[PDB]
Design a protein around this ligand. Structure first.
Ligand SMILES: *[C@@H]1O[C@H](CO[C@H]2O[C@@H](C)[C@@H](O)[C@@H](O)[C@@H]2O)[C@@H](O[C@@H]2O[C@H](CO)[C@@H](O[C@@H]3O[C@H](CO[C@H]4O[C@H](CO)[C@@H](O)[C@H](O)[C@@H]4O[C@@H]4O[C@H](CO)[C@@H](O[C@@H]5O[C@H](CO)[C@H](O)[C@H](O)[C@H]5O)[C@H](O)[C@H]4NC(C)=O)[C@@H](O)[C@H](O[C@@H]4O[C@H](CO)[C@@H](O)[C@H](O)[C@@H]4O[C@@H]4O[C@H](CO)[C@@H](O)[C@H](O)[C@H]4NC(C)=O)[C@@H]3O)[C@H](O)[C@H]2NC(C)=O)[C@H](O)[C@H]1NC(C)=O
Ligand SMILES: *[C@@H]1O[C@H](CO[C@H]2O[C@@H](C)[C@@H](O)[C@@H](O)[C@@H]2O)[C@@H](O[C@@H]2O[C@H](CO)[C@@H](O[C@@H]3O[C@H](CO[C@H]4O[C@H](CO)[C@@H](O)[C@H](O)[C@@H]4O[C@H]4O[C@H](CO)[C@@H](O[C@@H]5O[C@H](CO)[C@H](O)[C@H](O)[C@H]5O)[C@H](O)[C@H]4NC(C)=O)[C@@H](O)[C@H](O[C@@H]4O[C@H](CO)[C@@H](O)[C@H](O)[C@@H]4O[C@@H]4O[C@H](CO)[C@@H](O)[C@H](O)[C@H]4NC(C)=O)[C@@H]3O)[C@H](O)[C@H]2NC(C)=O)[C@H](O)[C@H]1NC(C)=O
Ligand SMILES: C[As](C)(=O)[O-]
Ligand SMILES: [Zn+2]
Ligand SMILES: [Zn+2]
Lengths: 208, 216, 213, 209, 215
């Protein structure tokens, strides 16, 4: 059996209304001794409150035990650590895990919208690309949209460690050539801690 | 600045395969910011796009005739080329090579065009020409028949080999699968600058031979 | 749905202003940039307007482009004579996935009622007769408009064929020109007397003749 | 709880440039001092081979060994999806450990390469970012390197491939250059290597016209 | 190094081909595009040339610019009348991190160059001398070209500041007109031996004077 401790969604830890949470999982746990234990501590200190869904039967003679703990925004944002102790049978020293926000002077991302290359304009669908660079830490959320409503056909690359120590990534939205040629605006919205009000936006569109 | 010159056999017999080439000057296809293509236009009708190619190879053809066309570039010699196979009477026109639109990577417009090049799908084979000195303000010319692939750079030369500030280019007429055009050149009464009187020169250019003759 | 249609011809008068339309489809002229090329007689087409209405530096302000719906149009203002040529619109067609042009539009600035066809006739050469060939050349220079019913006849009655005539051709003087040639065995140049090359240019049949001697 | 094995694929570049020599690496880690001898058994679609070369076992700081075995593979065997199996045997292993790899299965797709200039407003900075977009490729093995006037480039990074909505992959490569080099007129190039491409290679150039 | 510089003065005959320059450092016009703005006297600047040498729609073909090393320049070929105005050139400066405007270059067209600076001087008002004032006016009437200068003095020794002077200004005459005042209290006028208003229209130092004369 192995352990997997996951951190909160960047989007969640930046919007107060939303509720961030750290997830703990246990991969490869046979039917024999499935029953587990979960102990959660914050920088040593502890609190009892971590909902724990049942052992979702799995496709390999095992289960997927998940334990989620709701955290406080500024606590995550303020480099707090979280420990998950999984107690099992085939585990003499029940594996533990610890995770916290990335250390290091936060850095503000610069957002750049890039129009489709002119030769891609012969395809019946074009690429609107959004460059997000110079940010740190890598926790970030990026999504596209037009006319209030959010676009769906878009993809964002993983944060990439740049040369100067910051991260960057690209987000590609695909829109029908006709919607682009017509001049509809599209927007790249980025959420990140180092950004004023944790949010900035950049529109892109065929200037008439 | 930037220029494109077509090059190719002014003739092609049925079922054969046409073959032209375009040379660029004052611009290096290798820069990779533009596409280059070929456009043809049958004498009568209008323009028709054939294909475009990028310096790296990737090419775009016209569905109407891609199955029988071939385009390529050679960075080294800085030029691209065309190949039209199984030529018939349709494939008879002037072939231009242009650079695609003013914007980088444009693929739908041509901002700079080549001089042009005619391509007749004949069947009797080329042949040089045969000149014949023709008969205030008097002048004469120098007919010429026989030649097939029309393209005769006419001009004139006075007595002591001088450039006549007077020249003309008349429409060539096809009589029995062969062309033959004239060329009149008005002149004073007997003065000029460097023209005695012992006849003149009739410089007649052509891809299959540049015949010359004197007119009494 | 797959091809641009422009007016086969246009024509106007100096100082004026004319427009040429390009009726297209949604699969083309309605979703892509339109291009306008100008083609003065016997010349490689010239880019006139790109991306619907951009004028490449070296093109007159009088030339303007525009699109709306599935159509576009070129507009010439302050028309001149150096503007009668053929014009074409073109764009990418997403249906065919290829560049496409309209048929083309003629357009001829109406004016210059002065068409003096300075016709000229030439008697065969000695080298020709010394080779069974009586090729007479009637070189007719300029004349606006370019259209005449040249006539060839021997003495009085006109002969069937044997004579071949081309079509007009705008010269440097910007005047259409042509030329005709008459065959007929060399045993006729000396056989008959005087050959005329009539050219009825709307009434005026200016002509010349050559003596069989 | 003996040693455990790992079978790595050849570098994408070495498999698209026919003139190089791609190879699979079978790494056995956690080999004790008591039984340091491990035997490799290679196979190419079940047909065992013998042209593998084992590097001498290297001593590790955690009191164990790391043994390596490599198999050169034919430009064509790998790209045709041949399967390579490495069988590992060592005394501290109840039963030998087998591992397999090979190009991803599924029809290949030719990617498109797009070069995209910097946003006008990055030009107030001292360095500009040129962007190269590679989309529509499959399988995901790809290589990407920027270049100018011959010599390669130093400041450029490339995102990992990313699974698009149509099933193929896309990636972006970022070249950073002194703003001045860009404004002058230099011509930079994006070189991409993918099997699906022609001759497994293609290049797109970007520059300030 | 951080401030574009252009010839404070230009102006030339109609038809002539004038050339305005803009010199600077690498930090700016050297490494960034150059923009040229034309401000018609009395109106909002206008974009003339962008990206070194591009001309927006609604711009004469006479106009064209060009960059070079670390200095570029605008040039009007076929110089005209409705081409007279101030011409500013600007670029972004990578060291200041801000747009930088040149000093500006004024340019007038030539025509009917008869400068008749009919200067006039009015002493302090009767009622003015009461409120403890002594405003001296100098109504330099119409002339051409639009540009002059002034200098006031007591006896021979010229008084420094306090001589705020209005800028030239066109009339229907297309001839310009301006003026100049001089502060000074009454205890300064009724004392000294006459003051003087010296104008200067291209060379000629046309000048008149007023005296403490009670008539
Ligand atoms: C039997 O089945 C189970 C599960 O069922 C399987 O069924 C099959 C039919 C398939 O469908 C298969 O996909 C499926 O898994 C198997 O377990 C899996 O085992 C693998 C391999 O052992 C393991 O892989 C790891 O993956 C992580 C990446 O995380 C994500 O991986 C998958 C998608 O990529 C996905 O299946 C996982 O579930 C996981 O997804 C995340 O899940 C969490 C929890 O749900 C999400 O949490 C979010 O929380 C939010 C709170 O705000 C909110 O609630 C959201 O709703 C909620 O979703 C999270 O968002 C989600 N991710 C997203 C966004 O999609 C990868 O990081 C691991 O990397 C390695 O880990 C090794 C050990 O851990 C290391 O040795 C390696 O070095 C490597 O990385 C290092 O790891 C060490 C750890 O010691 C670190 O210290 C070090 O820093 C790392 N270094 C690096 C590289 O940076 C690893 O690849 C799967 O996670 C696991 N699936 C799960 C979770 O059940 C069994 O293996 C099967 N048996 C066998 C053997 O056949
Ligand atoms: C004693 O130390 C050992 C190692 O030395 C340590 O010494 C101490 C003192 C410290 O210095 C340590 O930091 C140091 O490591 C320990 O061994 C390590 O064991 C762990 C597992 O316990 C190994 O982890 C695996 O790592 C691979 C990645 O491999 C690379 O790891 C790093 C790079 O990050 C590097 O160090 C290592 O060399 C590997 O990189 C290189 O690998 C190839 C080797 O040649 C290179 O191949 C190229 O081949 C081409 C061919 O043309 C050319 O020849 C090139 O020149 C050549 O380089 C490759 O390029 C190179 N890469 C780079 C850039 O470094 C992970 O992929 C493994 O992934 C996981 O494995 C687990 C199993 O535990 C799976 O369950 C997970 O799902 C996951 O992967 C999946 O596995 C399944 C199983 O089949 C697959 O089906 C899935 O598809 C897999 N998913 C994927 C990714 O597709 C795993 O993390 C670690 O590498 C070992 N360190 C070594 C050997 O260096 C001992 O554990 C320790 N003893 C103890 C008990 O303490
Ligand atoms: C159009 As192709 C030759 O890139 O497949
Ligand atoms: Zn079960
Ligand atoms: Zn292909």
């Amino acid at each position: 059996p192995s352990v997997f401790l996951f951190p909160p969604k960047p989007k969640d830890t930046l919007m107060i209304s939303r509720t961030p949470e750290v997830t703990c999982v246990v991969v490869d746990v046979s039917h024999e001794e499935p029953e587990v234990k979960f102990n959660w501590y914050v920088d040593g200190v502890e609190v009892h409150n971590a909902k724990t869904k049942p052992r979702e039967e799995q496709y390999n003679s095992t289960y997927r035990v998940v334990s989620v703990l709701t955290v406080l925004h500024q606590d995550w944002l303020n480099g707090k650590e979280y420990k998950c102790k999984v107690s099992n049978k085939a585990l003499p020293a029940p594996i533990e895990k610890t995770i916290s926000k990335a250390k290091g002077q936060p850095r503000e991302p610069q957002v750049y919208t890039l129009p489709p290359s002119r030769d891609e304009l012969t395809k019946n669908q074009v690429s609107l690309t959004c460059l997000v660079k110079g940010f740190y830490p890598s926790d970030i959320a990026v999504e596209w949209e037009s006319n209030g409503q959010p676009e769906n056909n878009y993809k964002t690359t993983p944060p990439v460690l740049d040369s100067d120590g910051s991260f960057f990534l690209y987000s590609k939205l695909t829109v029908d050539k006709s919607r682009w040629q017509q001049g509809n605006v599209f927007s790249c919205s980025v959420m990140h801690e180092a950004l004023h009000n944790h949010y900035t936006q950049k529109s892109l569109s065929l200037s008439p | 600045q930037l220029q494109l010159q077509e090059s190719g056999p002014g003739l092609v017999k049925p079922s054969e395969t046409l073959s032209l080439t375009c040379t660029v000057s004052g611009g290096s296809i290798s820069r990779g910011s533009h596409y280059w293509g070929w456009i043809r236009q049958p004498p009568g009708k209008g323009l028709e796009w054939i294909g475009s190619i990028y310096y790296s190879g990737n090419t775009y053809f016209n569905p109407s005739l891609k199955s029988r066309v071939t385009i390529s570039v050679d960075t080294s010699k800085n030029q691209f080329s065309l190949k039209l196979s199984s030529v018939t009477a349709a494939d008879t026109a002037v072939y231009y090579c242009a650079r695609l639109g003013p914007d980088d990577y444009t693929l739908d417009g041509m901002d700079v065009w080549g001089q042009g090049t005619t391509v007749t799908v004949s069947s009797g084979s080329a042949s040089a020409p045969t000149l014949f000195p023709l008969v205030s303000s008097v002048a004469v010319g120098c007919l010429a028949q026989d030649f097939l692939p029309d393209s005769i750079t006419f001009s004139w030369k006075y007595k002591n080999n001088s450039d006549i500030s007077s020249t003309r280019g008349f429409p060539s007429v096809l009589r029995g699968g062969k062309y033959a055009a004239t060329s009149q050149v008005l002149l004073p009464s007997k003065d000029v600058m460097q023209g005695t009187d012992e006849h003149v020169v009739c410089k007649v250019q052509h891809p299959n031979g540049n015949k010359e003759k004197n007119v009494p | 749905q797959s091809v641009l249609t422009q007016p086969p011809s246009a024509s106007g008068t100096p100082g004026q202003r004319v427009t040429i339309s390009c009726s297209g489809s949604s699969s083309n002229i309605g979703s892509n940039y339109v291009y306008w090329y100008q083609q003065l007689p016997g010349t490689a087409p010239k880019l006139l307007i790109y991306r619907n209405n951009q004028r490449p530096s070296g093109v007159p302000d009088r030339f303007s482009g525009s699109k709306s719906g599935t159509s576009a149009s070129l507009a010439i203002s302050g028309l001149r004579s150096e503007d009668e040529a053929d014009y074409y619109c073109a764009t990418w067609d997403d249906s065919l996935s290829a560049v496409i042009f309209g048929g083309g539009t003629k357009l001829t600035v109406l004016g210059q009622p002065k068409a003096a066809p300075s016709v000229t006739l030439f008697p065969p050469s000695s080298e020709e007769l010394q080779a069974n060939k009586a090729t007479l050349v009637c070189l007719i220079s300029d004349f606006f408009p370019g259209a005449v019913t040249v006539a060839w006849k021997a003495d009085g009655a006109p002969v069937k064929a044997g004579v071949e005539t081309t079509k007009p051709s705008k010269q440097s003087n910007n005047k259409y020109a042509a030329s005709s040639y008459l065959s007929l065995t060399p045993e006729q140049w000396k056989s008959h007397r005087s050959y005329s090359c009539q050219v009825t240019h709307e009434g005026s049949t200016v002509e010349k003749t050559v003596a069989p001697t």
